[PDB]
């Protein structure tokens, strides 16, 4: 199991390590629970330094991306302008969901998971090619997600004039390098903050004064509860290569318009969109026990004929003090289910694939 | 701290003190909760109810998973920790005093007679 460069800033904080797609990161640092509480309160912030980074650059590159993605970054007009994408495979499966951000006509960069750095570097090295892209695998940089109300504040006091300068005002889903800082006013967790990537040899540094600028440590525990209560998938579970996005609530990232825009996926796509698919909900548990994922989801419609999704993620929501659930389910379901937990079945909600929005529940 | 003086511990990672009217109070170790996580439900025996040593007799869930709770001695379960339900997470704030999840009846003599002590516990977290 490899390791960041800030393996030991995070057992100076006191995490306690887990092994993360081959990578030693913090699970929690204490308490999830506190850590979850920092980041809806105040500022928490994470280690995202094993998310792949590529810089892609070269005449072709903004043709290459219309390409290659569903999403369409022709949409990307202002410099530093970002949006969040699926990649998809032939078949309209999603092979990652990643963030694009735009520089110059000529510069782009994506930002993809761990899990999936093999295969999508493969895949874009693999499509690149005959657009002849300069394509860049930055591990030469950490980068850190500081996330929270007053993340933005406390990070800003690290920065120097220039970087204040350049941030000023900076609106969601932009990112901008200055000097050796990249600042991205994009997160995964539902509230306002920045992630910075820097160098390798400047992140342990930047962690240290983040620290001590206020901002807690939070682990994976507290990534987990985070991002799904702001509704945000995770790859491996809400969506793979044999699910298609529209069954994965990342029907309103594929850019159908313009219609002459070809990429990848799209032809099976506009089938399935004409087949109908199954739709991803989300599941409230007002009784004590916690969702799990995987399980079963059951439910009667109205003519006496049982139909079954599946929990692609189940935790329990610290903000909500309720367990929640992303779920998978034919289309028809009503307003509540049945999951099965031990052997009992357990009464839920059935809900929009949201729980937190812009700071509450909404409930 | 975090291994008081006074207490008899199971393996199982569970403590148990002597009450002044011959009763055990049972909790998990700060060993125990730190593997744990932070609780967010426990699910207790019922009151009354006869146990085995070796029973899993009480569930803690944290956020990552459901685990079971086995009981160090045979007895009977005379009380159970009804803070817990609105605080569980006094499991690990204060896993020896606050956050103690029940109290026996022991039946049995010899098991008793073999439960680690302050000094037996502490060299069992050390041997791995
Ligand atoms: C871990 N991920 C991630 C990344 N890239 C970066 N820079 N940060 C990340 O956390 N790429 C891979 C995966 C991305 N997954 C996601 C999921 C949701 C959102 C997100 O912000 N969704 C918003 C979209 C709002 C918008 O498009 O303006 C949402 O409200 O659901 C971003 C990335």
């Known amino acids: 199991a490899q390791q960041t460069p800030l393996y030991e800033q995070h057992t100076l904080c006191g995490a306690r390590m887990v092994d993360f797609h081959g990578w030693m990161m913090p699970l929690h640092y204490g308490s999830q629970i506190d850590e979850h509480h920092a980041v809806r309160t105040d500022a928490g912030m994470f280690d995202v330094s094993h998310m792949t980074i590529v810089d892609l650059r070269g005449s072709r590159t ?77 591990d030469d940089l950490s980068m850190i997600a500081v996330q929270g109300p007053n993340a933005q504040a406390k990070a800003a006091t690290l920065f120097n004039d220039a970087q204040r300068q350049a941030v000023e005002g900076m609106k969601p889903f932009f990112g901008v390098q200055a000097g050796d800082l990249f600042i991205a006013t994009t997160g995964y967790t539902g509230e306002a903050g920045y992630e910075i990537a820097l160098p390798n040899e400047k992140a342990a540094d930047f962690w240290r004064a983040l620290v001590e600028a206020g901002v807690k440590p939070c682990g994976l525990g507290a990534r987990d509860t985070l991002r799904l209560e702001a509704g945000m998938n995770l790859y491996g579970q809400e969506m793979d290569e044999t699910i298609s996005p529209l069954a994965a609530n990342m029907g309103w990232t594929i850019a159908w318009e313009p219609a002459d825009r070809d990429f990848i996926g799209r032809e ?96 | 701290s975090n291994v008081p003086a006074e207490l008899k511990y199971s393996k199982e990672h569970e403590w148990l003190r002597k009450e002044a009217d011959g009763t055990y109070t049972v909790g998990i170790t700060e060993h125990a909760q730190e593997l744990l996580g932070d609780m967010v439900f426990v699910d207790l025996p019922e009151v009354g109810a006869t146990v085995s040593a070796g029973d899993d007799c009480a569930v803690a869930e944290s956020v990552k998973a459901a685990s079971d709770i086995y009981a160090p001695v045979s007895g009977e379960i005379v009380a159970v920790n009804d803070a817990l339900s609105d605080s569980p997470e006094l499991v690990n704030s204060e896993p020896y005093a606050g956050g103690w999840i029940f109290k026996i009846k022991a039946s049995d003599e010899s098991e008793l007679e073999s439960l680690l002590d302050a000094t037996a516990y502490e060299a069992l977290l050390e041997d791995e």
């Open chain 1, 62 to 138: 903004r043709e290459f991306l219309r390409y290659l993605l569903a999403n369409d970054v022709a949409k990307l007009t202002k410099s530093g302008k970002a949006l969040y994408s699926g990649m998809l495979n032939a078949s309209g499966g999603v092979i990652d969901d990643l963030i694009v951000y735009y520089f110059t006509e000529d510069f782009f960069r994506l930002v993809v998971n761990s899990a999936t750095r093999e295969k999508d570097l493969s895949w874009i090295t693999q499509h690149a090619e005959p657009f002849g892209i300069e394509i860049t695998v930055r």
């Open chain 1, 268 to 363: 099976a796509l506009e089938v399935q969109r004409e087949h109908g698919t199954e739709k991803l909900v989300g599941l409230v548990m007002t009784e004590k026990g916690v969702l799990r994922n995987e399980l079963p989801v059951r439910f009667t419609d109205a003519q006496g004929n049982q139909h079954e999704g599946i929990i692609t993620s189940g935790t329990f929501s610290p903000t909500l003090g309720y367990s929640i659930a992303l779920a998978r389910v034919p289309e028809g379901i009503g307003e509540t289910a049945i999951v099965q937990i031990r052997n009992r079945e357990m009464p839920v909600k059935v809900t929009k694939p949201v729980f937190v929005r812009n700071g509450k529940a909404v409930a």
